[PDB]
Design a protein around this ligand. Structure first.
Ligand code: NA
Ligand code: NA
Ligand code: NA
Lengths: 599, 599, 599
């Protein structure tokens, strides 16, 4: 009767108004409320205890309402909650329960997706405090946490950290901590305007799978000297990665502390992304302390087709150990990336490198087990003034890394600082197809292009090929006497080297070793016997006991004689060859030779 | 009057309740039903004949209801049907009509997209039977089938095959058979828990275009010995591909039968994906029998930037013929992939390879027309115990394949089994920039690193470069007498070769051919005349009629004389050079030479 | 009372019918209209002035209705307007206001996304006229335009240009002109059936950021001889790109005028896409005239992992200047692409090339500043008949370009037409790892594989390596006398060269320069003195004053003597070496040597 009017204006009203899709007689006879129940938004929970809707804004703490939404949808097996466009939804307090320990604001739950179309902002309650905006753990102790599965965050919206600085270096801040996370992702979202430790973390100590970050943007997420460290996406579960993202920082501190991506477990990737203003591109590291979920090996690591302007190192390789676990890194590919060091003074940020073999956190360089790394088809450029730029800074033990078909245009090709660490190196392979650029030509006074400041080098190949002159460099490659060298191949192509005083330098005459295979140019003075006809020439110096053959790199300006085209040696360390005196007489010549040993 | 109450509670109720968007006076005056009619879900068709909604579950066959939805939406020009989250929708019977012949469950229709947010499960009715869950053909005979256009399946949902094994090897099972499919795709879906032939097939015998699989997951889709074969996504129309997917198998049988992707037509790709537990990565094959829609050539084939742990072959190249059509494969690129053979006993699965040139289905090796393949910037690794691992197993005729700047770390570089097929090889190019790894060092007793077990080799380049010692190997490269060799270049760099008895071996002295260009190290015994002064040395053996020049790779321990630095030959097959006797006397020496022919 | 009935049938009806999500007592007590207000479609504005809905179709101009939708949603802070599936929405007039100057139809507005599920078609009103379907400028003068931010167009729908030809060459036509566009994108849309200048343009004269085109299709967008030019996506703001798109043309005119992508600002990319039927793949060019928003440098340019069949040039590099600005292009990577020239007569379209260094629009070749380009791991193929095919056509000044590990199979490796431009070349690097294919073998009568038709060449490397014979070619590499050559390395590997009359040719004897490093094969006639024993041989010609060493590439058919293995030279330009007469007598021989200078 008039009871009907009352029902209709009541909350159950829509449950009494019939609907059948497109008047189709074969369709289900439903009620309007049933169709509206097919979707869900924050508006459906953003109300006071009387059920009246509350408008969001800077004086409203939306946290409890969003939590209620997620908890309720979780209760029905999942779904997608929309965070509506055209509004900014402020968060103003910590969550409670299991996420309390993680300084969590919102607890994510399995199968409950968030479609963020509007903006989520942190209120000043969080200034100078830690926070983790979305947390997937359900326990304060991550080891007793259940899992988070099938949770996807996506949309055109924004998460804005409100510009608040850290209160103390020891604090952590995150956007999305997925936890022990399986089939979770973040797509399309802009994370901005903060001072945080990470924007997103996938996995927890190897527990997790199939977590991805795609088409997101990360903008100005470090802003203070208080911030101890930053990796925008931290990939800590296997079969997981970052694809087609954009990362930008503009603070000075970001140039010293910030890394775009950290890959910490097997079968992870970082691809198709653009970085600007960061210290570092990617960490690729097996931390023993994070090896509980997916084992002790980081393998199948891929960094590909990225574009970066950074201030420190592009890719940092590592592994370490704990009292009970030893970490290992292997089967890595770095390819297709175009990377430059941004304009900066020499030494004004961490040492510029395409690849860095870094020591562990405690600075130890003798714990690493890094091998089967392929670095291929990349471009790297540093401005000419940046003394501290290298294709590779090899500062810790290396068990293998292979470079093929790259283009490196920076100050050093291989570098480690002297005095410092003395890395044990095996299976360092520098193929002849690496092109060494000319930007730093004339800047290398006192310096060695490949500065082999290592404890030892074995089973390695360095094939140096210049593509322009740099007569400022001390040598193309130098081994100090402290570096053992064995079962290696070291060659310097003669092109652009004719005027170099030193090409390859072995300060402990390591090139004499039984299984060292070398070649490089040198200038040699020779004197002949006086005999007319076929006549020997002999080097005046006796430094060539290790030489198997040598050949001329100089023309013969003489008519009446010619020096030998090719030389061998003698037991006293002289070179000897057979030339020709048309007319007799003692000859004396200075010739550029290619010295060869076992090659 | 009270007629109004009745209208409102009726199915037409919502068609009588007015709505205007946001009270905007300029907006359309509509009825609620009009706005609800903008979307459509399974709920709108999942009802009994009285229009009452039916709850899904393991005792409800949702098939007819989903079919009705698709048929109805098809009738209005298309749209997107949501399969709601928070529910599992069981399928319990075969479809009828044109898809009956394809063992179809559901018939897809043009412009009707499915947004799968919940789960679709197969009921036990399908145990031991064939099925194809979604079928795009409209006729039992595919040749008389109409097309499927603009059909997209996407969402966060799941298709679960219920774990049922095949009933017989001859049965086929599929998830999505798109048919003659144009502008169709599958995005975001998890396919799991089955024993099937394929998860998705795109195209039919070259008919189709612009079909894609992106961000899907494929998990445990082979589970029995009954399963004859499996390719997770079968790409059988052009301008189509797979991108950023995840594939995983855990059964033993998958290691022997399962391939992640099959590319069978032109302008197809497979990229950015991760594979674990499969026998094979990708087939790239032009089957003559499937050449009706897009011609007889598979060209523009791309496999790039994938990550794989497999048990057999990463990329399998092929082509075959029928009585009226000859298949051809050309213009292929395989690049950026990092691939390893998983831990397994030698010979316990199909022979491990990065690239396999396979014979056709009937085993024929003389029908293939494969050329212009570029294999570049890949990494490959097999554990040291896996005897049956090769960069390339070349088991059928090859008309060209080019390898540049890869890193191969496995047992063989080039291999084919002896006795077996005798492939005719042209335009095999192995650039010097391929890095040969050391994992298998010391495992190669009795074996040849490049084992050229072919009928003939022409217009080919093998430039061998070691980066560590392996003195266990019989030779770096060996050609049996049965292999003709012409118009080729074969070189073995001397590095790490000084102690090798055999470097390159030509069992029929094929290196003597007019247009063979070779170089490799050998040890040679020489004896000099007694003359004081310039004095010839001559090899004691007469095996060097083919040598154009040789040079020393050994130092000269003597003071009183030196052997020649360089040698040529004589008509009787001796080497001859001019050295120097400071003091006269017959000299006799054993020297490591680099033997050179026309290089 | 009966007033209630009236309210309910009124437009405010739904605002009086209560709803609470899933009967959840903790949910907001809302009205149906509130839930319907969460989404918005064209239907909500596609009405007459009385509020009655209008059906779209070929006689209805939907433009004003769509504009009203966008303007209204803009007014509320944004949202997403759906263009419904199952309908075609015709556009039939120009927009008004700021977009009038841009021949705009619809004005886009910030934060207002369009989800296009149905089809948008142009009505014949636009035949022979300019148009820009969606425009993001808000002023006729782009320089006084505000920005467009956070505008995304996406869905499964279509934009169809109605097949109308241009009315005049000077007209412009576009699909989406985003304007000064920040965080804008287009995803999933099919653009088809037109004669336009561009489908999408991102940015305006460097103003914009983070604009992307992904998973779109572009089909048959040039159709007349009237069309002056076409670039399907024009990327004119930084941090922007195209990914995973499909481009196809079928008209003849497209083969001559159409380019798939133009990258015109820094930190832009083009990846994962497939092209067929176009003249050109991508422009990578810094236009001085478009350098207002993001500076004068195009750097971090990436073209990767694309598949193309084109008729002209794959990647075109450029830079130019204006009276006040000089453009610069640097830090470019082209990698992983597989590209072929489609079947066509020689010279029937613009000259086929993988890379083209093009002159500016006015044809000037002396304004360019292009450097630090890496071209690596690509494949290129042209059919044997296409005389006009080159790895690189270098037609303008070049300051650096590096080629590593590619596979080029076309007519020329390096080419520029003689007579024409005389490019100044620096830092051209052609690594030995580039594989030169054999398709054009026997087609090269009168031609030079590397035809160095330049003003000068400095700091360059050309390492030629053949992998099959082509005895038709005039030379492997030729420098005309007009080309200066200095501080370079030029080498021709001897493999497959034994029968070549000319290998490297220096028409002005440029190989004699102080800092030229060269090697190549030649045939040389020698004569010996009659002396028994060690005996000199001397070349009969005096053309070898520049030779530092030479070595034999021929066997010695003689028993009674041997020519020298190795040679040096003399001041008169003869070669000289020491061989051996077992028996005395004057010897005369023709030998294939490897001539070497400073290498
Ligand atoms: Na040491
Ligand atoms: Na044979
Ligand atoms: Na000149």
């Amino acid at each position: 009767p008039d009871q009907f009017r009352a029902i209709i204006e009541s909350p159950e009203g829509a449950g009494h108004v019939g609907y059948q899709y497109r008047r189709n007689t074969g369709s289900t006879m439903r009620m309007v409320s049933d169709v509206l129940d097919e979707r869900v938004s924050l508006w459906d929970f953003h109300c006071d205890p009387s059920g009246n809707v509350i408008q969001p804004g800077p004086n409203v703490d939306s946290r409890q309402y969003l939590q209620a939404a997620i908890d309720y949808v979780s209760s029905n097996g999942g779904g997608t909650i929309t965070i509506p466009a055209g509004y900014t939804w402020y968060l103003g307090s910590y969550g409670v329960g299991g996420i309390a320990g993680h300084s969590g604001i919102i607890q994510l739950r399995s199968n409950v997706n968030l479609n963020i179309e509007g903006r989520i902002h942190l209120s000043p309650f969080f200034d100078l405090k830690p926070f983790q905006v979305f947390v997937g753990f359900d326990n304060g102790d991550p080891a007793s946490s259940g899992n988070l599965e099938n949770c996807h965050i996506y949309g055109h919206g924004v998460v804005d950290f409100g510009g608040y600085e850290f209160g103390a270096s020891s604090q952590l801040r995150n956007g999305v901590a997925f936890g022990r996370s399986y089939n979770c992702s973040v797509t399309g979202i802009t994370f901005q305007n903060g001072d945080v430790t990470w924007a997103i973390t996938l996995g927890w100590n190897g527990y997790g799978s199939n977590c991805y970050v795609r088409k997101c943007r990360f903008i100005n997420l470090v802003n203070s000297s208080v911030n101890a460290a930053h990796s925008t996406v931290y990939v800590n579960c296997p079969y997981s990665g970052v694809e087609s993202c954009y990362f930008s920082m503009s603070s000075s501190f970001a140039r010293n502390i910030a890394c775009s991506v950290a890959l910490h477990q097997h079968d992870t990737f970082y691809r198709g992304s653009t970085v600007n203003g960061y210290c570092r591109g990617a960490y690729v590291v097996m931390h023993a302390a994070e090896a509980a979920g997916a084992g002790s090996y980081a393998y199948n690591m891929q960094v590909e087709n990225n574009i970066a302007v950074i201030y420190g190192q592009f890719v940092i390789l590592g592994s370490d150990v704990t009292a009970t676990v030893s970490g290992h890194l292997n089967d890595v590919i770095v390819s297709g990336n175009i990377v430059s060091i941004g304009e900066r003074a020499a030494f004004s940020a961490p040492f510029g490198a395409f690849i860095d073999i870094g020591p562990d956190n405690s600075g130890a360089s003798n714990v690493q087990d890094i091998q089967r790394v392929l670095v291929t088809g990349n471009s790297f450029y540093a401005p000419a003034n940046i003394t501290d730029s290298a294709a590779i800074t090899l500062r810790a033990n290396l068990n293998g890394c292979t470079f093929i078909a790259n283009n490196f245009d920076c100050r050093y090709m291989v570098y480690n600082a002297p005095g410092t660490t003395s890395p044990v190196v095996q299976n360092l392979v520098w193929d002849k197809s690496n092109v060494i650029g000319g930007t730093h030509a004339n800047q290398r006074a006192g310096q060695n292009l490949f500065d082999m400041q290592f404890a030892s080098v074995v089973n390695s190949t360095i094939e140096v090929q210049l593509s322009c002159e740099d007569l400022s460099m001390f040598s193309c490659i130098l081994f100090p006497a402290s570096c053992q060298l064995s079962y290696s191949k070291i060659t310097v192509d003669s092109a652009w080297t004719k005027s170099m005083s030193n090409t390859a330098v072995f300060e402990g005459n390591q090139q004499a070793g039984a299984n060292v295979y070398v070649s490089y140019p040198a200038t040699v003075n020779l004197t002949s016997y006086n005999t007319q006809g076929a006549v020997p020439f002999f080097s005046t110096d006796t430094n060539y006991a290790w030489v198997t053959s040598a050949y001329s790199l100089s023309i013969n300006e003489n008519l009446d004689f010619s020096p030998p085209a090719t030389y061998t040696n003698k037991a006293n360390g002289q070179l000897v060859g057979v030339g020709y005196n048309e007319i007799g007489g003692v000859r004396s010549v200075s010739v550029r030779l290619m010295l060869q040993r076992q090659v």
